[PDB]
Symmetry: C3
Subunit: 410 residues, 3 copies
């Protein structure tokens, strides 16, 4: 019969086709696809971020005591392993006099010694580095900086959000309307450079990280530099990422050892911290917990090889609520010739000092808005069924109530 052939001829193609296309939409769904929704929304306020900054130098040269030098000199490249000064013809005369004086161990009774105490006491004091401080055109004081220990030593966090302190906000973008600090980096307190190590800088300045209050600073890896002699502008953009969990993504939605709120920085410090305690029964200045802080012998012999080997293991995925701060750096010179003499008079320093040691850091929001980056689900379940039902109710006539009629037969 020609018709009931041409009929079932092209109907069998149509059932193979529905079988084909319906398999495509079930395979796609099981890839669990997502797409991205970029949006920007206007705002009237914006919570100002946390700002963590460090002097590139860890210990003030003048704050080193005789006791400090006995224990830490070989650690700091100020004594060779026989405990005396190299007398290298590279030196400041006055500093090498100060050192050999403090480094003469005749009839010396070693005293107790601790690395947090050294870091805390020898570290640069915000009270003397913070020549000037203004937030939204109102004044601020070293009280507004919370101390934090990083691999760069005693560092400070503005608007840290801790100890019941509210988070600062801003109501206008641009230079005057955020944080504007004038720092004095104190170059002549830098520990001298007579030979080289992994831990030696020719660098001079500060290191800065702008980060949310829910995450600690990781300023040795996430920092940026600000150099002396310039007022450096930091124009920021608030980005609110909302990312998708598994199966759609690799997000971490949950709660999270030594911290309470999960964040990639907080996670990487745990892997670093437990590894060092497990392999050396020891922690470093930047690590949380209760372990004893490392001794100079323990660092030379144990912790440095333990970290050196650790890199050559621990994966830390992104959280689902993440607020990031994008920034555009720009800079102009300080001081102007007109203000150079005044700044020296104002702070009892020479004009040469001001241009070698003064930086102004100026952090603000470009404008009152925040960008939103959200992974959205591409193929929900409701949309699959509409797609199959439409494909069924097209290639054939079936409903799901029909396919159940085929069981009422058998």
């Amino acid at each position: 019969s020609l018709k009931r052939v041409v009929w079932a001829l092209c109907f069998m193609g149509s059932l193979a086709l529905l079988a084909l296309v319906c398999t495509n939409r079930i395979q796609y769904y099981f890839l669990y696809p997502h797409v991205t929704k970029l949006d920007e929304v206007a705002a009237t306020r914006l919570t100002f971020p946390a700002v963590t900054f460090c002097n590139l130098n860890e210990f003030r040269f003048s704050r080193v005591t005789k006791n400090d030098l006995y224990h830490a000199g070989e650690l700091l490249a100020l004594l060779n392993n026989r405990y005396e000064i190299p007398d290298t013809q590279t030196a400041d005369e006055k500093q090498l006099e100060i050192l050999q004086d403090k480094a003469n161990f005749r009839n010396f009774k070693p005293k107790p010694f601790n690395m947090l105490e050294f870091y805390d006491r020898a570290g640069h004091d915000i009270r003397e580095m913070l020549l000037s401080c203004f937030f939204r055109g109102e004044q601020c004081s070293p009280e507004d900086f919370k101390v934090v220990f990083t691999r760069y030593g005693k560092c400070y966090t503005f608007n840290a959000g801790q100890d019941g302190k509210p988070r600062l906000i801003t109501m206008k973008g641009g230079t005057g309307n955020g944080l504007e600090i004038m720092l004095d980096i104190q170059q002549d307190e830098y520990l001298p450079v007579w030979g080289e190590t992994d831990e030696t800088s020719f660098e001079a300045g500060i290191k800065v990280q702008i980060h949310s209050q829910d995450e600690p600073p990781l300023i040795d890896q996430l920092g940026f530099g600000v150099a002396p002699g310039f007022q450096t502008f930091v124009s920021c953009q608030e980005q609110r990422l909302i990312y998708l969990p598994p199966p759609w993504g690799d997000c971490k939605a949950t709660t999270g050892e030594f911290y309470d709120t999960y964040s990639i920085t907080a996670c990487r410090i745990d892997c670093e911290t437990r590894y060092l305690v497990e392999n050396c029964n020891c922690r470093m200045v930047h690590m949380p917990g209760d372990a004893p802080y490392c001794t100079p012998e323990q660092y030379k012999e144990c912790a440095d090889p333990a970290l050196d080997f650790l890199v050559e293991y621990c994966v830390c995925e992104m959280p689902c609520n993440v607020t990031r701060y994008g920034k555009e750096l720009s800079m102009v010179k300080i001081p102007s010739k007109a203000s150079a003499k005044y700044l020296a008079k104002k702070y009892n320093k020479s004009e040469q000092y001001i241009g070698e040691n003064i930086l102004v850091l100026d952090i603000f929001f470009e404008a009152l808005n925040y960008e939103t980056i959200e992974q959205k689900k591409a193929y929900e379940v409701a949309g699959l069924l509409g797609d199959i039902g439409g494909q069924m109710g097209l290639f054939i006539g079936a409903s799901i109530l029909t396919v159940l009629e085929l069981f009422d037969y058998a």
Copy 2:
């Protein structure tokens, strides 16, 4: 056994109600997603470039009459009308002032801050040591004056009065705009004490913006320092965002013909200041009278310092739907080289010390000949709604829209 059957219709009917209502809610969220694209081009329209010298008024162009009317405002006179004892700056300046600042037998003359701003301001004619666009030279006539919160400022390629807008045909260092600026530090007003308005900075402020929007360079600027050639690698972005209900965008288009966040902020900030003090600042549009130095101290500084905190929503300025943004990557090298310092001093009758204190080279260009497009697309249209519910009907039931119409009888 047909109670298993009408149980199995009542269930499958409930499932259609649930899944179909989900797509009705989703549709009512008015969802959108984003389409990133990059498209090649053979030419590319060059932006406007607005720049300001960080100093507002040239020290040498300040007259006796200026000092009488604006001297206390500018931290050049204490409220007794004299140099403030401290006098912490070099004699030749302070000598220049002690003569200009002697009001014995002085007859005050009229004064206007815009006239002062225009007249004392840095002149593009002395600032612009050199200028090249697409390797061809340019002159101060290609820069148009605009008054900003920084004063008398200059915009390259302003696009106004029927002048064609420049284009570019190649990316990289030379193939856009390269200026050598003299910021003229020896003209900066002295600093003897501090004010809200006093800076230790020296250099220029630059904003790269489309010609459809005015410069708001005291917020949207960036700094360029003297002593460097500063490279500005730009990427053109044409973002097209969606109106309500999908977004919060503005397609509608007072003080300006074309909507822009900047035009809205300057407009709102202007209406506020005129309402509360009958007074506008130099950077503001319109026809209101310009603030006098007394009106600033007595009215506008407090009026603005109060709008900084207790206000905000007098204007939320929403984004327009068709927006061109310029991304910029800043880089720099030192100018001048040891070989070219001596040549540069000779060229401009200036000291070698001066050049390293006052010369900057600004280099604005496109990374490459293309533009990115960031585009909001609707995720769930009405046509796709019907396809989704119709299929669920034609799946859980055999139902059509006509079938549900028979059930009303």
Copy 3:
């Protein structure tokens, strides 16, 4: 059944919308970032802004190229302008005396190589992930700035280097001496003459040549410059959805090819930075033919040679930061260490520090917005909604359209 005519019209309406939408070939974008344990480090190409060393310029160099280089006026003599330091003006006034001189052959590629800055003397210090490296890790490549060097070229069978940690130390950390004293003196102005001093750096995939005259950034002396990178994997869509195109293709290699086919066709000449086997331009040929020939291409024949984007692309985003060099504590030491003045150090030394912010890579991918499977579901659902229709019912109406 009266208003059936309406519901059929609505099916025509909605079905035309989703059928036209399909043919726009819509795509939307999928942003994701995925964590990694290792990460392949890029190539880094850098140039001294200065092309030829003053000390390596010979009398023969000066005869053929002195006018090309604004070192001689078109009478072949020194401008004798005292606008440069005496020792160098004496060095050149000497080299420029053409009494009894037999000119010898000369080609521009040799000059670029020999007078160009030598990688062995610029590279004061080199560390990759804290381990030492040597000028042997730098492959020479010729760009418009002359003899330039590419670290981790990935060429000559060397495996591609990786890094396992982010931050300051764990990338490439070179300390350069830009050698301000070998910069050619500047006596007058040219298209090709600079007041600048420092280097130009480009971070690129090993699969593409550097286009450092267009895509570089500047590094200045007197600073350690921090370069924080983020690896981006772009996967973009071919036609009809997009305009991407699927030794190795790259946008850079496409432009350098258009630039070379054009210059050889019109001047039978190639420039130092160009690939192939054509002869290199003589100073007169550049003067007489190529300089106007390239000038013309930018204005009229960019439009004829169009270069589309590739479909698998790895980009490197960079954030520049800097701190001062050298510190007062280390200023005296670096002078002693390299037998140079403290003022020389602050005028000639930069430390370039390239690294990844952290161990992850972003992926920006164009995805198809409306495929064919999803079209049918939408129209099929619309058919089974406004009417009862399947495709079979439409075949009954063509059966019945056999009466």
